[PDB]
Paper text:
Utilizing this approach, we obtained a 3D reconstruction of the myosin VI MD in the nucleotide-free (rigor) state bound to F-[name] at an average resolution of 4.6 Å in the [name] filament and bound MD. Local resolution analysis suggests a gradient from slightly better than 4 Å in the [name] region of the map, where large side-chains are definitively resolved, to around 6 Å resolution in the converter and lever arm, where only the contour of the backbone is visible. We therefore adapted the molecular dynamics flexible fitting (MDFF) approach to generate a continuous atomistic model which captures high-resolution features in the best-resolved regions of the map by enabling fitting of large side-chains (blue) while avoiding over-interpretation of lower-resolution areas, where the influence of the map was restricted to backbone conformation (green). No density was present for two regions of the MD, loop two and the Hypertrophic Cardiomyopathy (HCM) loop, consistent with flexibility, and only the molecular dynamics force field influenced their conformation (red). The resulting atomistic model (‘HR’, high-resolution) converged well with a molprobity score of 1.44 and a clash score of 0.41. In myosin VI we find that the hydrophobic residues P536 and L535 of the HLH are embedded in a groove comprised of I345, L349, and Y143 in [name] SD1, with clear density peaks to support positioning of these side chains. Consistent with this prediction, the large loop 3 of myosin VI likely makes more extensive contacts at this interface than myosin IIC, with MDFF suggesting probable interactions formed between D574 in loop three and K50 in the [name] D loop, and E575 and R95 in [name] SD2. An additional unanticipated contact is made by myosin VI R561, which forms a cation-π interaction with Y91 in [name] in our model, discussed further in the next section. E354 in loop 4 (A355-C362) of the U50 domain of myosin likely forms a salt bridge with K328 in [name] SD3 as supported by clear density for side chains in this region. In contrast with myosin IIC, the ordered myosin VI HCM base likely forms an electrostatic interaction with [name], as MDFF suggests a potential salt bridge between R393 and E334 of [name] SD1.
Myosin motor proteins are responsible for movement and force generation across multiple scales of biology ranging from muscle contraction to cell migration to intracellular transport. In this study, we focus on the MD of myosin VI, an unconventional myosin motor unique in its ability to walk ‘backwards’ towards [name] filament pointed ends. Here we present cryo-EM reconstructions of myosin VI bound to F-[name] in the rigor state at 4.6 Å resolution and the ADP state at 5.5 Å resolution along with corresponding atomistic models. Finally, by comparing the conformation of [name] in the myosin VI-bound ADP and rigor state structures to bare filaments, we find that [name] structural deformations accompany motor conformational changes during the force-generation cycle.
Numbering used by the authors:
A (entry chain D), B (entry chain F), C (entry chain E): 5 to 371
Amino acid sequence: TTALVCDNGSGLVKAGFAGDDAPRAVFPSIVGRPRHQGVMVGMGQKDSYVGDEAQSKRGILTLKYPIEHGIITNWDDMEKIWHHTFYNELRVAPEEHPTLLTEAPLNPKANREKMTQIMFETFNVPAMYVAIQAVLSLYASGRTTGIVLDSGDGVTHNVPIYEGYALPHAIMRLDLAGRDLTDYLMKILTERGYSFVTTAEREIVRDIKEKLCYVALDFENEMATAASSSSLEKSYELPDGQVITIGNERFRCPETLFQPSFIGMESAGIHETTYNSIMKCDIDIRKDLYANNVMSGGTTMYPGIADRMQKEITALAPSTMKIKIIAPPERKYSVWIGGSILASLSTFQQMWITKQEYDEAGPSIVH
Amino acid sequence: TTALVCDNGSGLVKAGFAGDDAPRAVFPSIVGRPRHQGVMVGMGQKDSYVGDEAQSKRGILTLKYPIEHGIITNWDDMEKIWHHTFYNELRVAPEEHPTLLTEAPLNPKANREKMTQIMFETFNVPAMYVAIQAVLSLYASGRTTGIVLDSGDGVTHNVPIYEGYALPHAIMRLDLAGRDLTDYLMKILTERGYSFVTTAEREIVRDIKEKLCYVALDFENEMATAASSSSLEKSYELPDGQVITIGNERFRCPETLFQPSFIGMESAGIHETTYNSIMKCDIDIRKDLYANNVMSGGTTMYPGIADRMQKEITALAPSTMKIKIIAPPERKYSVWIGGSILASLSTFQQMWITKQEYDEAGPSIVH
Amino acid sequence: TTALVCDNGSGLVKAGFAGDDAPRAVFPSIVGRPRHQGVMVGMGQKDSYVGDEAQSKRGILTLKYPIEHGIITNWDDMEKIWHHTFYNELRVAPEEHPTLLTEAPLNPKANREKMTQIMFETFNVPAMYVAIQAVLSLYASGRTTGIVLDSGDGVTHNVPIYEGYALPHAIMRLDLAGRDLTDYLMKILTERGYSFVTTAEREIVRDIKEKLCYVALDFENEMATAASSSSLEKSYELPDGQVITIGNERFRCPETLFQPSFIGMESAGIHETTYNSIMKCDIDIRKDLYANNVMSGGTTMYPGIADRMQKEITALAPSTMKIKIIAPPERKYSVWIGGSILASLSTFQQMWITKQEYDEAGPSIVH
Ligand SMILES: Nc1ncnc2c1ncn2[C@@H]1O[C@H](COP(=O)(O)OP(=O)(O)O)[C@@H](O)[C@H]1O
Ligand SMILES: Nc1ncnc2c1ncn2[C@@H]1O[C@H](COP(=O)(O)OP(=O)(O)O)[C@@H](O)[C@H]1O
Ligand SMILES: Nc1ncnc2c1ncn2[C@@H]1O[C@H](COP(=O)(O)OP(=O)(O)O)[C@@H](O)[C@H]1O
Ligand SMILES: [Mg+2]
Ligand SMILES: [Mg+2]
Ligand SMILES: [Mg+2]
């Protein structure tokens, strides 16, 4: 009956039935084993904690993110993520619903095969399909044309779609935002004598990466008044009681995303990968990619975009073109709000890969 | 059969079966041989008197404490303590019950083996285990987080614990309180012209260390009003009828522990060893070590602590952090009431070292 | 006039003019004030002794290293270090030369500014520059490619360099060896019944860390032969006439630098940090990072590396890729013999930060 949209984020895995409100459960993609000797003898502990509870047990575990640079490390950790998601969040049996899974646009073969095969044999679902996360972000703002910028930890993408076809030859995948921003924040906060090295404490870096950062309009000129002894200091409080005063590094960390040359890699800035994906599309269609520029994903929630992005695009594109960048509030749930629209609707009600078809065809059902 | 918790005090050896009230026997850990020439000729007097009988025969013996600086001096005296303890207090044979023994956290190797080994061949016990005295103090107050203190005459320890694991990197052992406080009390009672030198009479010094002593809120401000003519004098009476009036030195002796520069040693104050053991724990756990500071051991019974310790820590700790320091009645028996809770409980009924397994393994069994 | 290279040791300050032999003066940085009351009104006693004289007057002082966890404690003690170093060792006046100072590759900013500024106002030197300690280790063995190690009591570092560019993305800082090895030797020597707790005596432990330790080739098998009566026992003689017999623990203390699991801290050994810095470098260059592995410092002077390090890396590295590990003699003076080659060579004779430029610009001239 009711289909299930379960999003394999690298965040922030999101789980909720098909429509109509919001993700039922969201928690960080963490499994963590206990690194210290037991001496109270309940015994009372698990062999492996998942999140939320692996984020309540900080400082006693060794956190292992099972998805790293756009790929899952091994399915031994992945199945334990899955077991936690179905059972102590959604509560429903896996044999009850057809499921809908998400992937990253341009993900390595044979990691969709191996996934599909393992998931059928481990949880015994009755039907399934895998839709890519960028394409789904079209549905959330309900547009049939435009270039989609879907940016989440740890893979961003630039996919062009026109009424309502996706060009296979103009899709760009960057392995950059947001975990490299997390690692960079840890590298420029060490620069003020605040050292973070332990895995649990690495989460604190994420919590200040969320809340306290912002982006400039013109970097060099916002940087200029930062050099003056004028306040940009906001004072954060740390869990053990420590008080940190950051100012410069606060706008510096997300600004890193414009120009990967700050980490020295040859990769082009979001400025130019957006533009170069548009300029791999056909000449006539370019007219309508402007003003259907749609940003998405959780790593676009800094309170200093899109007007940085705006000022940058308007400078690089042709003269007198209508360029408005549509960025809805609460971009982090865009993908899920996509998935919800698909699986609740017909036509695609008769289009899942069903069990008899899977048994007959085998795991080689890629296209 | 019911288990036996027999606690290897540094005091004050304590003995009583597992559960549920108080130890049956507590008495000074002393052996004393008769030093003066014999003339009564009944005769039959014992070669070595143990406590408490060696404390009702003061002035005719030469007391030799079998435990000094937290380690047992020789097993010739120790076996006579043991034989006396089981037989002439409890009235039971060690063959009947599994035992539970205690140690000092960070006790020199190879003195846990030789102990374990000698006890199997001397008393023919069916099973045993050795738990460290600091860890056991958690059970007494039902804590699942917090820093634990076994402070006895004369080895103290400082162990931080988080639910329900031990931290190898945060544990500190001081060979400071309390026998050096006794020896210091005898050295500063010489300052008022009352000189004591004999071992047996040293016990009287311990008895005034118990009853008369107290700690200040602020040393310097109690010291100021001590210089005034107003009375802090309490009049003690001595075993042969003599009257001593001490006042200034009365609050000075336990105050010595708050910074042992009085002795001359470089060793840090309890104030700071408490704090510095906390700042060797992981950052997110520190939040809950504050306000689960639980004191223990008989040597913490001076009336002025813990509110000296409280006022001192709140000054050294980060701003606006909650620090409730827990120190109720029962602290002299804290460790033992801990041991009682363990040996009655399952799972740990199957976790004693039993004789066949010992026979196979040998005395190399530690870890 | 000839420039002066004075190396701001983590240890262990080294001082000597630009080239070409060895440093004139080496001593382990300690300052010690006199802690007991004077009883000879002679008296002649200085307020602060530096080393050598503060290592001759052990047991009546409280030794304080001015550089702790890779940063100077405060400039009140540091300025007295400096004044002693230039004046009462090297004899030359700072007013007569450009000087050359060393730093860590990654260290709290702006404590390189404050340093540079205070040193200019206190000693009023004609010109200066601050070079990182890791880069200089290339010069010492005349390498044009390779990964550099400054490991001193207590900062290690891992910097990859390619002819003659430094790669920012791959620089890794470990706050691991060697003072935590000093603390670890003190923590496992209490396990054999010899206690060392007071400040002066802590130096003696450090001296036994120098001479008698060694690293195993195969850990598991060295542990096997330790359990038998097969002698690995060496007899040390101790300052007050005492005899120390160490076996197993002799190889246990340095083994800590592999596998930080022994302390429980979340980090990976030199084995893995070497690899993890290489696999953060661009693909083509990796070919010459293998076989230009250059070890350095004083805390790599154990007589059981590098062929352990080699056998371990060779197992983890890609198959049939040749890996030479070059550890020269002289490693304690590596940094200094590096600095010496640079400051004697033009072109960089005209590139010191000079007084007129400093006076106009202020502390920001650092970058
Ligand atoms: N307000 C915010 N500002 C900046 N970054 C944020 C904010 N909220 C969340 N993030 C980042 O966004 C990430 C979540 O992105 P998400 O949309 O879940 O990506 P995915 O769906 O691919 O997992 C988190 O890792 C977090 O670091
Ligand atoms: N009321 C008191 N005030 C101060 N000290 C006391 C008091 N009662 C006992 N003590 C001291 O505490 C010691 C006993 O401590 P205890 O908890 O038995 O240590 P352990 O268990 O390690 O032997 C005795 O040596 C005695 O000097
Ligand atoms: N033969 C040796 N074996 C092991 N360690 C040594 C030896 N000689 C010196 N050390 C250690 O090396 C340290 C000195 O390292 P050094 O190169 O001076 O570091 P830095 O230059 O950063 O101060 C000393 O603290 C000492 O403990
Ligand atoms: Mg995504
Ligand atoms: Mg005790
Ligand atoms: Mg160094």
